[PDB]
Curated annotation (Swiss-Prot):
A motif (Switch 1) lies at residues 27-42. Rab-1B binds GTP and GDP and possesses low intrinsic GTPase activity. The modification (Microbial infection) O-AMP-tyrosine is found at residue 74. This is Ras-related protein Rab-1B. It comes from Homo sapiens (Human). The gene is RAB1B. Coiled coil: none annotated.
Length: 170
């Protein structure tokens, strides 16, 4: 029986791997194919944390600009928002500031945030230095993790740490 029900949103630029992060966490599957999300997709996953059962309702948003006014509708309900960039794509990291701005515009004032640098397995094509991204996230008091949906690395931890932080402030 459920102790908490948290709503999470994944946002960030098209092609950074939001959908693959959710597929990995919710279905333990992965695809190398690129099929952009139309609007917002939804999955649930129940986790156990600190002896508590937490149901997570997770919305995976389209990163493409033409969906953006619609995706904004889901921001208010979120307890936690995960902002994803691709560690091989500098512009996706540069657009983190824009995404943080969407959060300020549309989200609840007390929303928890996490910055994720995805595709950490692409070690030879990495252009966003993790010390840079970590200094950035520190400067904002936002937690930071690098993930690989492909190799499963830190995927469970990203969702688990987000839940932990939500649970602490209630
Ligand atoms: N090597 C590697 N490739 C990844 C990883 N995650 C996603 N990809 C690849 O990146 C591409 C885009 O992934 P996808 O999850 O569809 O991106 P998205 O952020 O959901 N795009 P949109 O916002 O348009 O729906 C796919 O070709 C996918 O296989 C990762 O951790 N490692
Ligand atoms: P929008 O409000 O159109 O939602 C986008 C998609 O997510 C599905 N969905 C949203 N919220 C839930 C809940 N709370 N439970 C189950 N499914 C949900 C919508 O039905 C849309 O397809
Ligand atoms: Ba949809
Ligand atoms: Mg997607």
């Amino acid at each position: 029986e459920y102790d908490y029900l948290f709503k999470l949103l994944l946002i960030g630029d098209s092609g950074v791997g939001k959908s693959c992060l959710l597929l990995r966490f919710a279905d333990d599957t992965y695809t190398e194919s690129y099929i952009s999300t139309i609007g917002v997709d939804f999955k649930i996953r129940t986790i156990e944390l600190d002896g508590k059962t937490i149901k997570l309702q997770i919305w995976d948003t389209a990163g493409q600009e033409r969906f953006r006014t619609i995706t904004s509708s889901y921001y208010r309900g979120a307890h936690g928002i995960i902002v994803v960039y691709d560690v091989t794509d500098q512009e996706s990291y540069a657009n983190v500031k824009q995404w943080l701005q969407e959060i300020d515009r549309y989200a609840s004032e007390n929303v928890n945030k996490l910055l994720v640098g995805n595709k950490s397995d692409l070690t030879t094509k990495k252009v966003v230095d993790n010390t840079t991204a970590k200094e950035f996230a520190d400067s904002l008091g936002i937690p930071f993790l690098e993930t690989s949906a492909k190799n499963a690395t830190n995927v469970e931890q990203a969702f688990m740490t987000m839940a932990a932080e939500i649970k602490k402030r209630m």
